[PDB]
């Protein structure tokens, strides 16, 4: 039910983003992995997804659940988005504290170009 | 003398008494006294009918009182003008619609129940009738 | 009716002032806040004072 | 564990009359002398002497008889 706790933590900001109709960048941090994907303002369709389950990153990395891996997948997702033409998003920490791995992903994305 | 132990509010609107009745099935006992008319029974009339029927069966069998006076009826005093707030509660009443079974009884033969209900109904302002239990 | 009203005079040298109420009994210490002062269009500290 | 909040907590030696030495971390500060530890307490050879049931007719016939 830690799941339900953090989902309740996320729900408010998620619905505010829903209402503002902004393209939101969501993360989802597990112990052994970290994910990211930008989802169209309607919320049902996803634009680009970058994850540390992908071989293209899992090979370059040494351990998957740590801050440098988070920065790597953040770089990956911001690059894929900017290539697809998306450059203005909003960050949806999806319940996790904006700190450590998630903050690292966010800084890497900001650095790679995603204005938010 | 039946009367609610507590009520949320002391006085109640007059209201109307339209429609048929709800508890129109003899369920508990084997015979019942179904009302055919329509009006309002009082706690006094209910108690009088109960006394009549229980004495007629001589403390035998089991009876049920399927109605309960919850409506508080109020009256103004005498020689008082017509304004100046609602009255004050005098007695309690149970509105009756056609078909509402009033009393129930089992454990006594059918004819003895007939007589007991006759002696009871002779003290009720509503026209009533005897009804028996039915399957389904 | 225990809650008197006060004026928060500006510390920007003007005579501008707001006006609110304070419970003089439980909070005897003066009220100091930073409110917008429109005569100089800055946020300056405001120090309370008597209505007079 | 915060820094200045909690008290000192160091490894302290505890010696009993059972002849058992025990290295324990505790707040006692100095060394420690025990009188009774777990292994010496009269708990497993005491459940009879700490009740003392006995029998009065036995006491009587031992006191005297026919």
């Amino acid at each position: 039910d830690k799941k339900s706790a953090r989902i309740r933590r996320a729900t408010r900001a998620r619905r505010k983003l829903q209402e503002l109709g902004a393209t939101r960048l969501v993360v989802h941090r597990t112990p052994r992995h970290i994910y990211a994907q930008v989802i169209a303002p309607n919320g049902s369709e996803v634009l680009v997804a970058a994850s540390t389950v992908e071989k293209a990153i899992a090979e370059q990395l040494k351990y998957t659940g740590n801050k440098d891996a988070a920065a790597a997948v953040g770089k990956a997702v911001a690059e894929r988005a900017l290539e697809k033409g998306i450059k203005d998003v909003s960050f949806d920490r999806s319940g996790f504290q904006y700190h450590g791995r998630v903050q690292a992903l966010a800084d890497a994305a900001r650095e790679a170009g995603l204005q938010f | 003398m039946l009367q609610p132990k507590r009520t949320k509010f002391r006085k109640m609107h007059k209201g109307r008494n339209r429609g048929l009745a709800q508890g129109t099935d003899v369920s508990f006992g084997s015979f019942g006294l179904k009302a055919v008319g329509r009006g309002r029974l009082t706690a006094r009339q209910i108690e009088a009918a109960r006394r009549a029927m229980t004495r007629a069966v001589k403390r035998q069998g089991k009876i049920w009182i399927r109605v309960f006076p919850d409506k508080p009826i109020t009256e103004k005093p005498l020689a008082v003008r017509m304004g100046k707030g609602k009255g004050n509660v005098e007695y309690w009443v149970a509105l009756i619609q056609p078909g509402k079974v009033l009393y129930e009884m089992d454990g006594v033969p059918e004819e003895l129940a007939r007589e007991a209900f006759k002696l009871a109904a002779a003290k009720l302002p509503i026209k009533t009738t005897f009804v028996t239990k039915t399957v389904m | 009716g225990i809650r008197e009203k006060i004026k928060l005079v500006s510390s920007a040298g003007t005579g501008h002032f707001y006006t609110t109420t304070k419970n003089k009994r439980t909070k005897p210490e003066k009220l100091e806040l930073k409110k917008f002062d429109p005569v100089v269009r800055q946020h300056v500290i405001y120090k309370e004072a008597k209505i007079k | 564990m915060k820094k200045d909040i909690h008290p000192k907590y160091e490894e302290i030696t505890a010696s009993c009359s059972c002849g058992n030495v025990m290295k324990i971390r505790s707040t006692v500060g100095h060394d420690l002398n025990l009188d009774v530890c777990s292994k010496c307490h009269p708990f497993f050879t005491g459940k009879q002497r700490d009740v003392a049931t006995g029998g009065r007719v036995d006491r009587f016939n031992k006191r005297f008889n026919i």
Partner: protein, 177 residues
């Protein structure tokens, strides 16, 4: 940590062969030992509560949390929000150190120890017990102390029933009986 190593090496396999467990994760393991000292006299004297807190910080290795009146009860002239207790949670190496200290020093030192109950077990395995004098812990000295306090221990386990919790403490040769 001596008792913890002992647990990991003997007790897990002993409980395995005892209860015919299939996964090692099934074996009951303790999680926290909670220490509580409810000082009702604190509303009369707060310095009493402070001294109780100090004694608890002595008995354990941690500063205690000052519990406060959840509700306002007139039967004891406590108003909601009053500081009336102390609490210490012990997890990990601190829990194991206090557990060892307890069952090896304090239980033998308690006055007229004829054994602890085998039926104070919450029905859910979690054991709890109480002491009547805080001097039974060698950390505090009876010439230094002024008032004799008490407290109660609470051994929370992941035992489904209480039979397996008691069997766990027995594997730890807890001195209850």
């Amino acid at each position: 940590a001596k008792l913890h190593d002992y647990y990991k090496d003997e007790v897990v396999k002993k409980l395995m062969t005892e209860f015919n467990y299939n996964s090692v994760m099934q074996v009951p393991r303790v999680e926290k030992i909670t220490l509580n000292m409810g000082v009702g006299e604190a509303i009369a004297d707060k310095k009493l509560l402070d001294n109780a807190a100090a004694d608890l910080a002595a008995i354990s290795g941690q500063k205690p949390l000052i519990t406060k009146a959840r509700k306002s009860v007139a039967g004891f002239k406590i108003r909601q929000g009053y500081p009336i207790g102390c609490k210490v949670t012990l997890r990990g190496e601190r829990m194991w150190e206090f557990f060892e200290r307890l069952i090896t020093i304090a239980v033998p030192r308690i006055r007229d120890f004829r054994g602890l109950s085998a039926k104070s077990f919450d029905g859910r395995g979690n054991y709890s017990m109480g002491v009547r004098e805080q001097i039974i812990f060698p950390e505090i000295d009876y010439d230094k102390v002024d008032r004799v306090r008490g407290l109660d221990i609470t051994i929370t386990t992941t035992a489904k029933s209480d039979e397996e919790g008691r069997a766990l403490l027995a594997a730890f040769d807890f001195p209850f009986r």
